[model samples]
Target chain A: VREDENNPFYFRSSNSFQTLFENQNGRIRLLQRFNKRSPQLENLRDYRIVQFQSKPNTILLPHHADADFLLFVLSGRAILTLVNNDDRDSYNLHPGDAQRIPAGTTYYLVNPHDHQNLKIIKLAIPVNKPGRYDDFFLSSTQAQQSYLQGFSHNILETSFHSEFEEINRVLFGEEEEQRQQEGVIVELSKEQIRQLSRRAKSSSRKTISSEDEPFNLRSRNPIYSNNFGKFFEITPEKNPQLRDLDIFLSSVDINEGALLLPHFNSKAIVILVINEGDANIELVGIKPLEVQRYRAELSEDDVFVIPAAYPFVVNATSNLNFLAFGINAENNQRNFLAGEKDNVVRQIERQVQELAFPGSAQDVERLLKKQRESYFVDA
Target chain B: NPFYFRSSNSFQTLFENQNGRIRLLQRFNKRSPQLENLRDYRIVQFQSKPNTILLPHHADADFLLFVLSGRAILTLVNNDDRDSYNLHPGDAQRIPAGTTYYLVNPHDHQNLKIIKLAIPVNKPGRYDDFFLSSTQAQQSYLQGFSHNILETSFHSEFEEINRVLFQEGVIVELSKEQIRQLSRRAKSSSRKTISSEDEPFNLRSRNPIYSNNFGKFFEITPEKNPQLRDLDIFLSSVDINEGALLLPHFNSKAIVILVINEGDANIELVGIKELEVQRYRAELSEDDVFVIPAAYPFVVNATSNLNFLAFGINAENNQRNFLAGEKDNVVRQIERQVQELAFPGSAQDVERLLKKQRESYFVDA
Candidate 1:
């Protein structure tokens, strides 16, 4: 809806604010500081972020939010749950572990540490609006509509052989236990949480506990890891929330002495960050029938944007730790630009794998397939 | 991983097929937390007891129901000339658009079970069922006819018609006394196998998890599947177990055609349709096949269990957009928005989310 072309996407500190939640929890606050609402953010508004700081060891309770939230660990760790059916999938969050909570998924966050707090920054695209997102809380059966609302009560009662009152009893908590831990955020002590854990363990595990299980990004096997460097990715397929935004998450690491092949994305716009270490990058483009070039030697904490369709190459220098990671706006395929003799060119067609280096079709095929890694890994 | 919904977290329940007959749907999926491929197929597993009669009803989906375990008695009402037939465990029957029909578990000593592949892309997690004697939410298309000009044309009274129009259940409950008397009404027509202009194609000769290293693949395009080939379907075979997995890639605007050739296999799919992002994981059996769109990630794993034949529509040489594995996808090109999407916020998160992992396209996974 916002079609302003002159907008600059960079978010400065001046465009920031802090909103506090006084009624729910006195100390809870959200640095609602984000460029999403600003016209300057351009297309980045869709992937903008807002930082939420739950008071030390506090809870964000159980509720459904109106955004596909890709929550990355900022500081302390927290235990989380996404509700599906009658059961809950638990996420034991640690630093560097990413948790993408999709819209309409019922979730709750609990800080288990006694001293440290749980800090999570959510990268999300608003479902209904452009700036901020909304949440609907489910506390008690009487808090709003029937706990088992949504479906027409007539269908609910008649579908089964039960009476209306009996259905109500079943819809509401059959026991008092159902009433506990139902809210926006319930701050229970570590002991109470331990008991809840025991209770969850005592209950039968339902069939709907699949994706709710949290997977640590670090623990996941890499797509490519060798002497040249390491590379990997976490997309919506692994985390539903990423797919929700039409965005793909991935990382890149180059060995200090290696170099990435020159290539350009035909369809995707990339946003990159120097996670650690340093790298020297060169971007090449053609304008006005003339070639244009730009170079940058960036180190840790540097943020860079690579416009789509621009050709570029990178040198993994020892300066910034030889590491970088990025997120792209859309899923796209890439055409490699390297000849067979190029050491950086790991794979090419079997027929044209090498011009000077003669080899059989099977030999070329084996060479192409032998390197089991994708991206900028040393051949 | 192409799929997100765990096949284990699924919609499997008991439904009254018609009065006395209780049909068990061992598996079914629509928009749910269980299966990510909920776009085109409304797969249902039908299990029934012998001698049970299914009430007359029709579905909003087109389907082909295959007998997997026992025998079945199927009847279709098409004016003066209806189609009635017996189906064995190896038989398959097609039910075209909006055909009013009734099914029964015929053999007294045998149980019946079937797998129905339905075309239903509009609704997720919901099946539209219309009954002959008037049903819920959706009324029988026949009711519209009876409600109008057909009243006096037919000798049936208005009150009697009303009684039938608003019966307790479209599926009726049956009593067990009819043995020879029941067989007395059996049609004497010979069985038909070839698919003619308006007949059935009774084709009887049919037909993992985690580790990517466990796959054995045989791809079948339209040329391989013959009649199904031109029908916008692509097929392939895979085998694996022990946490092995298929290359994680998006089918690319395609509709899936998956048929389990053997054992039990696990499925994972993740789809992002505009405003909704979903993940599903399901546990499939020997013949269980499902359909989902090609816009998300899909993978096969036999780590613990079945690899089967999977096909796609309009996906020939579509060049899958690999989201994970060794393929250099949009993500691997650069972490562009990596810092933007709460990634590099703490630096370490970005490194972890994008760093080289312990595995590859096909490893000890």
Candidate 2:
């Protein structure tokens, strides 16, 4: 019973998440076991995924991590403050907004809404360890240590130009336990929120380069759309930063009972995570001519892999939504197995078809031509 | 007049009964209306029977003599010294503009074939061979000079010079005794070691830079062959197994002219621009020639065991970037953070899937 569940090609995101931080105000859950289970994933050990949730009026104390990452807003609103050498910038992030944070840069997050919880997902590349990252908090917390506390008292005193007692009072005061109990995330008083808002001026999107500014995926036009589904893609042409990084982003939304036609990437390895609804998936490996079926319901957060040149199709029963991360995706193209316009079979010369099919050339044409539309269609 | 010139239709017989022949692709504009921009380049091929000699000559262009088969003795005349080198199959020797030289097919039973790519320095797609021997079919350039001047230059009577020059053909066959005497003279001619600067460079002498079960690649850049430095050109040889594929890739900074030496293949090229994509394809066989522009991605599928040589122009610090493969691909350098964000699933799964192909550049079809 457990054998199939342990298949190396797929991972259920449900039970693999490890709790990184938790408090009354918020929690952080990290998924880091995918690379450990599949040897094929060895090259990806540098990546780690973390999900963050925080209540309204709370603030994630100023901190930096040993990794670079892109933060995507899943719900609610957030005020993000990023700091560089002698410079600081802040952005007002709403749902669907995405921004990149370079490794070692200091940043803090605040849930700006009074009645909503801030939810964010991060894809991080660890700079020091495989599948692991550490946060260096600037503020004290019960769940995490403040990096400054690691310094000797004399060193801290000299660094701040203060006496050991004053440095101790400011860093490890008698009320340290009370402050630590609130953790790295703590509720901000109404008065403090008012002052923080007044002091923090959100920068305009035009002030930064297109690659440096945040963009909302929901606002961009869908690359392909129809009554059945919509497909959104972001390539290096759209995001210049991704050109140096050599990556591409895309999302798919399939209507209930719809089908995504069988297709394979000519060069890219596609890995998709289910974000909403349920669907059935099928993958066909051409080298050994084998078919694998994941007919079981594929719900939210379930992850799957589609190797290069492996044809796959999706049969959906809900508003199935998924996001795909493509590796080696620069100038990558999708080759559809069957379609009215772009199908490989439709492009073959009639004489060659006759030779290949022996006597059913017209029959093959009729069967292929029956599908008048391409890509998305009824199941 | 066609853009594509067939090898069989291009050769002009230089000797009776096909004993010697030369195929030249020159006069760019006269051959094709679209070749005006390529008037500076020329291609030539020559074949000669055993025990023959090409008369001493000079040209107004620099060229490379690539021995395709058999053996030859290439001699270059300096003011007071003449250096001769033995050229075997796969050997390449550079001949500078205005330097008098001659070639000898020294063997009794084998024929010699050589290919040349010349860059005219004094004229656009035009050059004249100044043969020293004055045969009925060919006249020596010295004949154009005044008789007294020629006599003074040769330190002999005009009649004596004419008789000696007109007695032999431009390319004359040697008797076995004559060949033996020439061989002994050449062998005992120079006691000093020949410098690498004037020596023939053999392509097979160096190891291949890249090799796998599917194919092998050999490249000789200016760094490896100093003689190529002045021309800024490089040579590369590719040998692939039948039914294998040379994956889609492009050179960073060189335009390559490929000459198919053996077997057949199907080649595809893609021209990418900001607004459109242009696709070009060709089916290549033995002796076929094609050009790939810099940064244009191309893929080659061998229908049989294939061998080809690529001559790269503008080849300074050029690199071949592969678009696919797990390790050698340019995409492999992308950070996992970006890869994870680009696709819907975990970057781990994406990495695993790409790992399926263990080879780079060349792989099984």
Candidate 3:
């Protein structure tokens, strides 16, 4: 834990999350608690981050959540199915594929790969309370409970048009049921995989085109790249579905010893999570009418926040990779403080530079224009 | 003249009686590509005589109801509970798509006038209302199904369902006693079941963002009514004194749907293209509607006592960045050093020039 009595910002880690559920086949973790220990994080009380990992050939039960989810696959291959009304659409997902599952929509995930485990990061925006969400699972075992179980036995029997004993045998399994012991994420057999892998054509359904499909950050070309690093982002303009959620997803990869230019986002407060390698992250703060600087050596699983309008820069100690979730990301623009082509300083008038800086207009312009690179450069 | 539409010039009467009428603005955005973004939006004007009701119905689109004159009683059925809201003039409410709602004009002698902005879900610039009760022009949604299906669904015979579903028209005048009975039930039901957030938001009752002898400006944001949060829209009302002027300002992200509720104004907007800045000037009168694109600076010069309501689309985190104001002006927000550089002169002179205005959002002409 990192803290300061006066400083409102603090670096977070995987330690902040609490394990939501764990079984032999899979485990889920959620950032459920609001830590006033870091005041800046209080802005994120309305948001929740969940980590879901499942072993190979396992299936997460069909369920609907009271929250909208922006799921990003971190590793392995999976098949995600979203059921809306009578229509079901499935997406083949791999590492770096980001997909949106809307609130109240029933969805289930299957780790189709037989060897690799599926790891996913989910950003959930709850429709009801902040930092809290309920998942109404369609099927459950002795340990897990199904939302449908709340109904009376007679009501269930009447609804399904079956005897209570038979309904229980089919839904929760037989009275001596030990098959569901593995819980919500149960391993599927080869035959079951074959049945699920084959597309259901019982009813007429059209496959969503690539334009409306899950965006794969790793597969697609990077938005910006140089010899030093590459940056990829999913914007609402590019994905119409993200417009309603107003969330931005971005990832940056920096070569060893490369430095990311100093820049700030105008509208969004970015939560940065280090996924791989090491980097020295430095950020500037202008609060209480005072200038304060903080630096943290970010490693794998480390999380940090960049407040909106606060300039920050990162230098890669090793080949660094990080993902950022931007809240209030609608129409967000990154204003680079020190760059040649995209620098805000270049837009400032020459005479203003003379007055603002301790140098002549020509000298100030020369200093700013010297950096020919835009966003990334060698350390 | 082509860009700014005078809605009164082209209102097609959808339904009318001696006591009330409902008029709809013709398909807008047909003439220009500039309005392509708003091709999905449609507007309607509804009027009802005292002691009348618009039967329970649901539409294929989401709509915002703004009470323009008199009072209204809006009842929405959600699951088993009926949420009813009492609305006065300048009040706004959002009825989501497929939500069953009914409106009642609950006053004696007064005519209830309302303006609606609808966004179609399945079609562009088109929406159909599915009434629960069959009228001469419109049939009940249940009637669309086969008589056998209807019988099974309602647990009633085909003749029984048909008789119960029959109605006169979409809008019907009721007796004073009938109105009072429904009004009383609505009040009691509201007291027990209505969620405060789902109630109508009165723009006039809220504190003005800017108020003076010259004008008053009120904005209804998502914070004021949580219902708007889902749509990411906001409502703003400005009542300018005669010959007053509203300072030039641009919304950071929202596109403004300006409706001249009453009075006249000379509206000027500055549109910037890649090559040059285009100036759009229009003399708008009562019932005129205009679309102001996002980040386009606009100023309103009230020819008379101008009153208008604006629906701000993409209103989340949107702010009015004023180009010229006494306080909070974009020029004033620039650093003194930057101002000195840009003006190539003393920053104090520019500061003095900005300080000349005595008011902020509104100014005396």
Candidate 4:
């Protein structure tokens, strides 16, 4: 709803960007809006919600987007079919499940259950090209604006080594299949799959995990080693979209009566949103008289911004668990300060460490080296 | 020629315990500690002992290799055409970035000596070239996929995959028959050359205007080599004399990647940061590639007779902005501020710093 015409960002259900798409039993009401940035801005990057109300067998066929996206399921069951390079596998998704689709990767989503309507909310950012989101779909059933049609008939006929009719039936079926897709998804079929599956597989230590499946971020192991809590990171290398969007996915979970040591991110503006539990956050800054401190109870979907260089500490309530996810404006990275085991005070050289702590260079070095634990710390 | 200007600081040679096949010249970024931290190119020689093979590895930058000596075979895997190309003396081939392929010594008597002109991919210093699999003897290209996704996607385990993704180093000695079989499989691909019969420009004649003790410098643009059309690069063989120098100058439009053809040279780059002048210098011997950032006022003085080959990015219309020598030197345009910043020294010292050389931008032989 446009309460004020001058304010393009303030829109309600009346008509900000309530672009809706519905079929026989499934409807995808979306809100993919771009704030009018520069006069030359073409596509508003994102803000997602596919208020995805689906039919029993709704299948969003093989397709891709011009941007990378994060999909979060809200209700029902979801089955994702993904094929990249030579790897093809399927994953089952339940509520609260998350997955990363790198911009340009091709995949399909379906609610295979006979009586289930999967509701999914997607978040995506533009890549390769800017401002707008373009979807390119690939369906052997039918397509007009699909990428496959862009190639010359002879090109496909020779490459696929098939008759024109067979090529069209297998790749360029005469229907409307370009409902969505693009950045870069390599398509594959059964016979094509069989050929790759038949090729000799090399197994050795030299194998590089350059890319991988976007396993549930919550289910993956936490990399930060701390006694107070743990923080898990989702990188572009593993998730794929991190490169195009130039952002990061991270989550921090602390135990009861525990503390999250003070830490500051390098080259990033952290958007910390509390997904579960409550914690007190103290932001330490210069000028004691003007320092900003806020102790608030956080619940699902509460958001906050911790500007770069701002040192902040999170202490869990007396007897409750705390969990939060942060959407970092930059790559996955952070540098810790005092109050944490892996703080800056401890990383300085032997002599430099003395500038802060009064002790012999040897004593100072030894003391600092003793503080290498992460997550939960004695201090 | 320009006079020798000495500037220095401590340069500790930190040896890395990690040993690989390539050996860099000692003078590579060895003089200036500041310049040593810069991301640039490396002058490296790859020699495969007779019947040796370099396993699969992908570099961040493109490897433009020159066949210096020996008859060798180069295996390349790019796109759909993964083939082997024979590299004879003077042949040049550019292996595009991240293309993993292998090469074999092919010959039992002659070792392969290749001088590579690498255009570095972003990452400071060096990101070890990734490798996984290598054989005692292999047929043609040996470089396999550099990423592990190739495996996870292939449904292959590490036990079955002889990976090049690890640091198996680079070159592996091949077996007798192994080299024989790959040698037979080597399919030679034709490439353009830049030597005697192929050279179209003779500096003494075509560029006589720049000939003499003044230095005979000429460039090879796309017009001279059609194969270089799509590549935005210009090549030049800049010649100077022993103890001679090229006056302080700046190429405003291009960034230069220069390599010493022979002899020794000391280079200096000057810049004004936060209203203060900062300088970066380096001493280089033959085979060292010196990278000069664009619009950086710099000087080059040879310790001995020198001929340097420099390839530049964005060298379409070659232009030079020498700060000294010519009457039109840029110093003339900023004389007022130049005098103001010349505080500690008298006007005379400033004159020495800004004085124009009577000749062109160079001196005697």
Each model's backbone clash number? 70, 9, 0, 46
- In model 3, the runs with Cα more than 4 Å from the true position are A1-11, A32-43, A198-212, B1-365
Q: After superposition, how far is residue A194 of candidate 2 from its true place, in Å?
A: 4.0
In candidate 4 chain B, where is summed lDDT lowest over 10 consecutive residues?
B1-10
Q: Residue A120: error of model 2 in Å? A: 1.8
Whole-model lDDT, model 2: 0.67
- Candidate 1: segments with Cα more than 4 A from true spot: A1-46, A50-56, A74-76, A84-87, A114-121, A130-132, A135-189, A192-211, A235-247, A252-268, A273-309, A312-379, B1-365
Docking quality level of the chain pair in candidate 1: incorrect
Ranking by lDDT: 3, 2, 4, 1
**Chain A of model 1, TM-score against the native?**
0.54
**What are the per-residue Cα lDDT tens digits for candidate 4 across A196-259?**
3322222122221223333455555676746666777655555444544555666666776666
lDDT (tens digit, per residue) of candidate 2 on B242-297: 99989888999887767777789878888764379867777778766666778889
Full ranking by TM-score? 2, 3, 4, 1
Tens-digit lDDT string for candidate 2 (A56-173): 9999889999988877776788888898989987877876667788899999888878999987877777788777888888876556666888888789888989997886666655
What fraction of the true interface does each of the listed models get right, in terms of native contacts kept? Answer: 0.00, 0.00, 0.00, 0.00
* Inter-residue clash pairs, candidate 3: none
Model 2 TM-score, 2 decimals: 0.52
**What are the Cα lDDT values of the candidates?**
0.49, 0.67, 0.72, 0.51
Best by TM-score: 2
Candidate 2 chain B weakest lDDT stretch, 10 residues: B186-195
Error of 1 at B298 (Å): 43
Interface RMSD of each: 32.6, 34.7, 32.7, 23.5
lDDT of 3 by residue, B145-165 (tens): 344433432334666545434
